[PDB]
Write a protein that binds this ligand. Structure first.
Ligand SMILES: Nc1nc2c(ncn2[C@@H]2O[C@H](COP(=O)(O)OP(=O)(O)OP(=O)(O)O)[C@@H](O)[C@H]2O)c(=O)[nH]1
Ligand SMILES: Nc1nc2c(ncn2[C@@H]2O[C@H](COP(=O)(O)OP(=O)(O)OP(=O)(O)O)[C@@H](O)[C@H]2O)c(=O)[nH]1
Ligand SMILES: Nc1nc2c(ncn2[C@@H]2O[C@H](COP(=O)(O)OP(=O)(O)O)[C@@H](O)[C@H]2O)c(=O)[nH]1
Ligand SMILES: [Mg+2]
Ligand SMILES: [Mg+2]
Ligand SMILES: [Mg+2]
Lengths: 439, 168, 429, 51, 122, 431
């Protein structure tokens, strides 16, 4: 019951899924071999792990995941590393030749020969789950297989599974620092698929995570490992409501309608705190109000999208640990009193809160410190128009005189697809601006 | 939910029911919390709830009260639990003969407080000329009246040796 | 006289669990089901909430409802969870998701049939039931959407039974749901024409009582629900126990519902003192009456002195005197004649029960049909209109089967109700 | 020359906590095995006890 | 002084606050010095008990035990200096000769009742 | 409850805060680790769940030497790694740099941490800003942070302990420029401003305490003793309690008049403490003597507009009143005609504490002096002369000109400073 299927696409999706599944195994007490530790081999088991791991008669759990990448390097790294026993040889579908940052190549030429197998794996995973809540897709729109193959997979999932919930925890290109040069093309081309064929989209850009790790976790040289550890902590904090008993448990559809006001408006900003090392954690008064304020601070979130430059639409808080409902209420009241952050006029309440009794867990050999209480905040706000403006100004300045367009048109993509994507992103800006405008 | 816990097979024997409930309970010894499930299905019988029952009385072969329910521990459930219970609550027996009956309460008080034992059970036994050989008690206790204490503590055998050396 | 109870949603299930363990304690029923009460008066009317099996042990006459099975598992795992009958745990697979449409039109319809089957068998088991209780929160999806469907179907099947609906209407500053005004507006119109009496509760007022009336720093939901549990146990105690002047649900309805639409009451409970103030205050009807009408002791966050009491009812428990139970209420009438409506003389129904709640030498439960409750309806309607102007959070309802015309009709019914309260608050004789 | 490059090391290891040598033993707290934060207040007494 | 605190409390609940003189009587009947075994026995016949750890701590801080030192610590340590000199003044008045003997006649002569609040109540 | 947020700016501010906190830790019995081996510390320290406490103070300086000295010294355990901000390059005795160019890149995060501390606080009494206007950062950021605090918290209580340049001794040549520039900020956006000049406390330590070679450690230790004496009324119970607003409403007769003289007595050494019989009258007389005054402002040269005496120890109202009458009788000091009472006293039962590395001998009775006097016009009449004699022909001005400050700001600051005494002697003139 309450199962959710994790589909990981691209290198970024594969690595963040590796971190997520390591952390899930740590929370549910699952050894890297895929089985419970021998010393605590109780015959009867609870239903908590059922949401993420499928049980086998031998007593060895199997994650409800589908790793998928055209490039075989990362999937072979998973199949060779410490989680080879945990991971099925199937549901780890591999390609042979890469997309190479090309949305056209990953969606029109090389994606068709593997999308069918990917959907076969999805059906095999879904028939095992009797209470499937939905799908969580981890990928980065910057790359080719993340954008193209991810777009195709989300389209096929939407056309096959009907109105099943879909959460793309995707990594958009960060505003000032970027790794790929055709990354603006990939983002602007995949925003069409993430708009119509994805029910909720979460921004997980890299430089905000870097700044958070540098300024709060006190790491001078953070890496993708630390970034993915934070992303996995956020995923666990959001999904633990149905995994563990809490004062106010929420499911996927519980916050789906509370966070999506309009069908076209579902992009949401993410934030998590307290994220502090052991060297500093006990120096501050880690209370519910303090952690809520830290989350609402522009420097305490996972995205480079200032809320003070925008306007919040709907806030959802996921408290974990020794949190008290009226401590949450006091935090909400002080947020109402605070004037730096302001909500839209037509949404008076604008708050969702879910209290869970499970505090976050820290990976062995990690750098974060376990805390009495934590909270993850996911918010729909009008400020995402600014990151959209950054990316679309990037795209127009790149597209002024036909840069890199020959690569895309040589892979079965029409030239007008870029124009259609640009108009779609312009409309995605315009509707945000209109709904943020005062009544 | 990841906290270290002691898992024990337990029985309840609800009135009218022809069979015991056949539960398992985990006590999180760092706190006062207990939780229970049933062996066949696995549904949560009791949530994580704090109880006033001391941790020392949750040893094997002991019965306690959980919200008006007589719950009896039958055996351990995991070998980590067996190891930690052997380390912490080790059981032993002390038999006091008939010449120390006027100091029966004296000896019991020294068991409870001087020797730091916790008395899981205390009884009296009339020794028989057959039971003496059947259960290998000292021959001087034959056809007499003795008191037997099942008591648990760390290093229970050594503590019992210290007791019998310090008393008559 | 039998009352069969229903719990809807997580809030309703938790409140029902608290109320069931409180009433089991009052009747001396252990989780095993065997009665061990120290007085035969408990067995004398143990039937109202309890029906016994072939083993001589009683089970609650309760029906549990939720699309999610998680709260069902928690309730069953509670200290008194095993007391409930297993077949009465009716649960689905996919939750409502705080969607009144999902809980009332598609996912609730496929399960309300089984709920009606179990309710029918429970009602036919008893001689002749006095009626139905429901415990739910109008802000949620399955508690409200399925709750109102239950109300409608049970009203259709049993027209002449008394329908009490303990509705936890939630406040914005203590709120935790964005579609809260939508759900509340869609539930209130059903409750208006479908409930014999609605029992209003606010989490803000419960928190206020827990903060300053009880001086408890951080009492959780397990302590908030105990107060409404005591409210239910004291409002129904007239049936289960004898008294100098006994009453019932029909008596309270006829004495507190002057007009068919005027059946919403705010709740308060007395006495309520801290542990440190237990030995400072004398327990007497004089001290009970002063806090009966006090705002901080009232557990519905709608301010009482901005309205006129159409009617009120005082259900006293404990061996006391009939003088000071009514002479002091007359004193309240005289010295607060501005706060009490004019054309209805002696707005106070008074009832006496000989058995006080366990641990209390004397107690009283206050049920008031004041017109000040229009503040809650008006402001939740303002929130509803504020979101409804821009059609926000509405594609879910439209795709689930709701209609804009039905939303407008719900708004119109809410406005009609609030105007009905206002025109009696302001008008004179 | 590339063989000589062996002795060259990395100036800054990756993912290194900037520890300033706290006195955890005197503080009585093990940073790895201590849940840092505030134990939420436990309201002494309950509604059941009040009634 | 955990063993001193434990023994003082244990005696307080088991014998009553008003009759802590039993421990002094037992320790006076004990010889000076006294062996640890007989110290345990006589001290503990009045049903005051010490854990093995507390007993080991007592033996280490004090086979022979300085019973006089134990008496002095029992009557001296649990008092703040205010109480220390108050009881010293009371004992000095009761025994002006510092002979360590208090007689019934002298104690009755030096003991006041009339100012007691309860006898003022009558 | 009764929280008071401390802020320290610049080298002088950080040293004064170090002395203050090493005093408060012993006053509360808090070890440098942060835990003791009664919510009295709630005013200054925030208790954690580990059984230890964190001070409610923000250290701030645009140069890192002082802050890393704090981060490496004994109080690493006590001090939070944040609220201990460091800069990248100091103003270097340049108000223009500390206020316009390089202070604006740190003021935002400074206010972020300050408002975090404020949210942690529940009944915040006010802010206590320790700095020296004679410096560059202590003037520039002392203006920027204070004006931002004023615009964010409205009329919230602020007490600025400012080490003003001494009339004769100064360690900088642009010190008068900085002082005249920053008096505008210390006037408009500071509820009370406390004089803490150097050479007066230097002479006090040399004469009363008898040390041949005292130092900045000693001067900041005495300043911290004065601070604790003033703030102890809201920290311990007393016969007469005085709060921040309680003495603000007594020491601020006009909005422009909030610059206050301070002194403390008995300031005595170990050898001389035992022999002397310290009485309330004796300590009050020693306070009112200019020798015990720690600011270069002669009481005899002006009229005391208001008096407020923090008495600490076993002091008693009878002896307080007897000393009050003696001060009224003797003519050494004179009060303003329209202020008949002119006295306020706060009696606290907690005797002052003495810290390691110091020279003060602990006295069972002590008293601090916070005064509004018309003689404060003389220090400003020294400063304006000091500034004009250098600004007459445009010296040390290109540094400020090239850092984004208009040349007319000097004239505006000079006119404001002149208005200071044009108000001082105005309100001091007899009716
Ligand atoms: N958070 C996170 N982001 C990553 C990670 N790896 C890469 N990224 C970013 O995500 C963007 C997308 O890159 P990929 O995930 O490799 O997508 P791709 O280029 O199509 O992958 P391939 O075509 O198989 O090489 C890159 O530009 C990186 O900046 C990661 O491990 N974690
Ligand atoms: N009370 C006190 N005053 C000091 C101390 N150190 C220096 N001062 C004086 O305070 C004045 C201000 O100078 P600094 O302490 O360096 O402050 P600052 O100049 O703003 O700091 P920077 O601009 O970074 O150099 C100096 O002219 C000194 O005379 C000290 O430790 N305590
Ligand atoms: N008194 C009380 N109120 C509760 C409890 N649980 C939830 N609530 C309230 O119910 C509201 C949410 O309703 P919900 O349970 O989601 O309704 P549902 O979705 O239909 O099951 C929240 O605003 C809470 O204030 C509880 O245990 N006791
Ligand atoms: Mg790749
Ligand atoms: Mg009748
Ligand atoms: Mg400096």
């Amino acid at each position: 019951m309450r199962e959710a299927i994790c589909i990981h696409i691209g290198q970024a999706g594969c690595q963040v899924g590796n971190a997520c599944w390591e952390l899930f195994c740590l929370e549910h007490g699952i050894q890297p071999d895929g089985s419970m530790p021998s010393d605590k081999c109780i015959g009867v088991e609870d239903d908590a792990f059922n949401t993420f791991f499928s049980e086998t008669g031998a007593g060895k759990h199997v994650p409800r995941c589908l790793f998928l990448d055209l490039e075989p390097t990362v999937v072979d790294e998973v199949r060779t590393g410490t989680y080879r026993q945990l991971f099925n040889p199937e549901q780890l579908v591999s390609g042979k030749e890469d997309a190479a940052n090309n949305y056209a190549r990953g969606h029109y030429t090389i994606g068709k020969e593997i999308v069918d197998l990917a959907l076969d794996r999805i059906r095999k995973l879904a028939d095992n789950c009797t209470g499937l809540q939905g799908f969580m897709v981890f990928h980065a729109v910057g790359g080719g297989t993340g954008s193209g193959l991810g777009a195709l997979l989300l389209e096929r999932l939407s056309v096959d599974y009907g109105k099943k919930s879909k959460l793309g925890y995707t990594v958009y290109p960060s505003p000032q620092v970027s790794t790929a040069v055709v990354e603006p093309y990939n983002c602007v081309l995949s925003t069409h698929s993430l708009l119509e064929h994805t029910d909720v989209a979460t921004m997980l850009d890299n430089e905000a995570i870097y700044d958070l790790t540098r300024r709060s976790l006190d790491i001078e040289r953070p890496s993708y490992t630390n970034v993915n550890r934070l992303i996995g902590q956020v995923v666990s904090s959001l999904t633990a409501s149905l995994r563990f008993d809490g004062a106010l448990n929420v499911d996927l559809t519980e916050f789906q309608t509370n966070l999506v006001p309009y069908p076209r408006i579902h992009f949401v900003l993410t934030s998590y705190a307290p994220v502090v090392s052991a060297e500093k954690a006990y120096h501050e008064q880690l209370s519910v109000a303090d952690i809520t304020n830290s989350v609402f601070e522009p420097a305490g979130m996972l995205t480079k999208c200032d809320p003070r430059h925008g306007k919040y639409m709907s806030c959802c808080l996921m408290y974990r640990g020794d949190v008290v409902p009226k401590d949450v209420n006091a935090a909400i009241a002080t947020i109402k009193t605070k004037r730096t952050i302001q909500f839209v006029d037509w949404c008076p309440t604008g708050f969702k809160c879910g209290i869970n009794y499970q505090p976050p867990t820290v990976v062995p050999g990690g750098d974060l410190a376990k805390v009495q209480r934590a909270v993850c905040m996911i918010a729909n706000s009008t400020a995402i128009a600014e990151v959209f403006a950054r990316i679309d100004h990037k795209f127009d300045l790149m597209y002024s005189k036909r840069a890199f367009v020959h690569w895309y048109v040589g892979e079965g993509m029409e030239e007008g697809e870029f124009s259609e994507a640009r108009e779609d992103l312009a409309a995605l800006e315009k509707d945000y601006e209109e709904v943020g405008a005062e009544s | 939910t990841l906290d270290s816990r002691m898992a024990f097979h337990a029985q309840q024997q609800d009135p009218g029911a022809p069979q015991p409930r056949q539960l398992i309970l985990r006590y999180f010894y760092e706190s006062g919390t207990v939780e229970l499930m049933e062996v066949p299905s696995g549904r949560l019988y009791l949530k994580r709830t704090a109880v006033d029952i001391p941790a020392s009385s949750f040893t094997v072969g002991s019965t306690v009260m959980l919200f008006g329910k007589a719950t009896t521990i039958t055996a351990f459930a995991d070998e980590v639990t067996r190891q930690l219970c052997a380390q912490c609550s080790e059981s032993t027996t002390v038999v006091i003969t008939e010449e120390a009956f006027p100091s029966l309460g004296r000896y019991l008080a020294m068991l409870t407080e001087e020797c730091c034992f916790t008395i899981t059970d205390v009884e009296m036994v009339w020794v028989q000329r057959e039971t003496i050989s059947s259960f290998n008690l000292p021959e001087k206790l034959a056809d007499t009246r003795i008191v037997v204490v099942l008591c648990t503590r760390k290093k229970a055998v050594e503590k019992g040796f210290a007791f019998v050396e310090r008393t008559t | 006289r039998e009352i069969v109870s229903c719990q809807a949603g997580q809030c309703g299930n938790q409140i029902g669990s608290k109320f069931w363990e409180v009433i089991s304690d009052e009747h001396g029923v252990d989780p095993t089901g065997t009665y061990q009460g120290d007085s035969d008066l408990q067995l004398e009317r143990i039937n109202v909430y309890f029906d016994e099996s072939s083993g001589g042990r009683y089970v609650p006459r309760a029906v549990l409802m939720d699309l999610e099975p998680g709260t069902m598992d928690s309730v069953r795992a509670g200290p008194y969870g095993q007391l409930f009958r297993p077949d009465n745990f009716i649960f689905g697979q996919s939750g409502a998701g705080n969607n009144w449409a999902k809980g009332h039109y598609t996912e609730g319809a496929e399960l309300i049939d089984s709920v009606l089957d179990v309710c029918r068998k429970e009602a036919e088991s008893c001689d002749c039931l006095q009626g139905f209780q429901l415990s739910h929160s109008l802000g949620g999806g399955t508690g409200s959407g399925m709750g109102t469907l239950l109300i409608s179907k049970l009203r259709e099947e049993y027209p002449d039974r008394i329908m009490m609906t303990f509705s936890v209407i939630p406040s914005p500053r203590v709120s935790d749901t964005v579609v809260e005004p939508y759900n509340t507006t869609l539930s209130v119109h059903q409750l208006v024409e479908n409930s014999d009496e609605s029992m209003c509760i606010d989490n803000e007022a419960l928190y206020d009582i827990c903060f300053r009336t009880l001086k408890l720093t951080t009492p959780t939901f397990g302590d908030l629900n105990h107060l409404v549990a005591a409210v239910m146990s004291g409002v129904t105690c007239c049936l289960r126990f004898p008294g100098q002047l006994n009453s019932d649900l029909r008596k309270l309805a006829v004495n507190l519902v002057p007009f068919p639409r005027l059946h919403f009451f705010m709740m308060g409970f007395a006495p309520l003192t801290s542990r440190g103030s237990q030995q400072y205050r004398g327990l007497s009807v004089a001290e009970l009456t002063q806090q009966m009408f006090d705002a901080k002791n009232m557990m519905q966050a709608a301010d009482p002195r901005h309205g006129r009491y159409l009617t009120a009812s005082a259900l006293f428990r404990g061996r006391m005197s009939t003088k000071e139970v009514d002479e002091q209420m007359l004193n309240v009438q005289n010295k607060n004649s501005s706060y009490f409506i004019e054309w209805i003389p002696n707005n106070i129904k008074s009832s006496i029960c000989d058995i006080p709640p366990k641990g209390l030498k004397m107690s009283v439960t206050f049920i008031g049909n004041n017109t000040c409750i229009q503040e809650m309806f008006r402001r939740v309607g303002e929130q509803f209109t504020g979101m409804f102007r821009r059609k926000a959070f509405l594609h879910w309802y439209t795709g689930e089967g709701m209609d804009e015309m039905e939303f407008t009709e719900a708004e119109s019914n809410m406005n009609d109700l609030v105007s009905e309260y206002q025109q009696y608050q302001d008008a004179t004789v | 020359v590339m063989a000589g490059y062996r002795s060259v090391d990395v100036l800054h290891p990756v993912g290194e906590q900037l520890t300033r040598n706290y006195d955890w033993e005197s503080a009585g707290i093990d940073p790895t095995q201590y849940r840092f934060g505030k134990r939420s207040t436990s309201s002494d007494g309950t509604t059941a006890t009040a009634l | 002084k955990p063993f001193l605190a434990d023994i003082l409390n244990k005696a307080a609940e088991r014998l009553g606050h008003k009759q802590l003189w039993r421990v002094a009587s037992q320790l006076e009947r004990l010889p000076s010095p006294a062996s640890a075994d007989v110290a345990r026995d006589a001290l503990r016949d009045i049903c005051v008990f010490l854990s093995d750890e507390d007993y080991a701590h007592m033996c280490e801080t004090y086979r022979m035990i300085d019973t006089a030192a134990l008496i002095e610590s029992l009557s001296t340590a649990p008092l703040t200096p205010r109480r220390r000199h108050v009881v010293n003044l009371a004992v000095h008045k009761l025994d002006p000769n510092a002979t360590g003997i208090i007689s019934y006649i002298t104690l009755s002569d030096h003991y006041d009742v009339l100012r007691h609040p309860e006898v003022r109540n009558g």
